[PDB]
Amino acid sequence: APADYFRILVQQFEVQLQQYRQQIEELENHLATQANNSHITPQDLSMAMQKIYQTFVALAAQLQSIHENVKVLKEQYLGYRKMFL
Amino acid sequence: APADYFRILVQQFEVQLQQYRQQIEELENHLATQANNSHITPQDLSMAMQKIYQTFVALAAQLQSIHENVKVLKEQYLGYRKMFL
Amino acid sequence: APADYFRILVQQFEVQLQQYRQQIEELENHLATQANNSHITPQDLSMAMQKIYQTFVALAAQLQSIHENVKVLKEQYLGYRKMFL
Amino acid sequence: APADYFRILVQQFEVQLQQYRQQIEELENHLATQANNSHITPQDLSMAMQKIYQTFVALAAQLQSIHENVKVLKEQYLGYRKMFL
């Protein structure tokens, strides 16, 4: 600590960004499937866009949590700097 | 004529989702290198999160445009469907 | 029927290429964490390289499998064209 | 230090693996493109496979170059080991 703490926060950011990326990839491939199995439809397009917004809301929650943690770290360092002047 | 338009709307959605995934892939690959040579800093994490939000706001604009186009196609679809029924 | 057979061969190719990507991407994600928070013995670099080669040999077996099927399809196409001329 | 050199070797591996993934992804999107346009053809499948083999041979060359460097590093450590006995 505290570099260990931040190292965990960074590991979390990366891993979350990967999961998200692969959720998007799953969509791209789901469409690539129903592009040569049966031309894509409006219904498909709408549920897809819907899955995009949804999965991003999830990602954003994750990023917000990470943001809170780093903000705490910043406030701690701050206090130290306020004492030292 | 309709199927063609929507075919182009589908092509747009896919290629937009591709570009998006590429930008995110760049971010990740940038953190995987800027963490190997030296150590990622809270500044990097912050700017990365920021670029994610910006990148999604862009993608979202693209998606809304596509959504308007399909909505129009739906308006016409109902234009006929209402007369014949 | 010929178009259908080939259609299946085509989505088999794409999907095999997808899974191949996932295997790689995964290998990279394992390095973007186990090497950015800690160090990594060269023999782990060797293990990764070895997983690359093995994963490719698998992919190549898949590709040759589908290649045989298109080759047969070509032989049939050829038989028809030859009788006709 | 030998850690700096090997650190560069690791950065090379990762970056070459990302590049590789990008070439495969590009080719993988190219098929998604020429699927919604017309229909993927045996010509396409053939050239695509050829692209896979060709791109992997390049990747393997890169990996071989890396392997020789780590090999040298190992022989060096070895020379030290034989002295210490």
Curated annotation (Swiss-Prot), chains A, B, C, D:
It comes from the Eukaryota. It is found in: Nucleus, Nuclear pore complex; Nucleus membrane. O-glycosylated. Component of the nuclear pore complex, a complex required for the trafficking across the nuclear membrane. Contains FG repeats. FG repeats are interaction sites for karyopherins (importins, exportins) and form probably an affinity gradient, guiding the transport proteins unidirectionally with their cargo through the NPC. FG repeat regions are highly flexible and lack ordered secondary structure. The overall conservation of FG repeats regarding exact sequence, spacing, and repeat unit length is limited. In rat, the p62 complex contains two different isoforms of NUP58. Isoform p45 has however not been isolated in human so far. Belongs to the NUP58 family. Component of the p62 complex, a complex at least composed of NUP62, NUP54, and NUP58. Interacts with NUTF2. Interacts with SRP1-alpha and Importin p97 proteins when they are together, but not with SRP1-alpha protein alone. This is Nucleoporin p58/p45. It comes from Homo sapiens (Human).
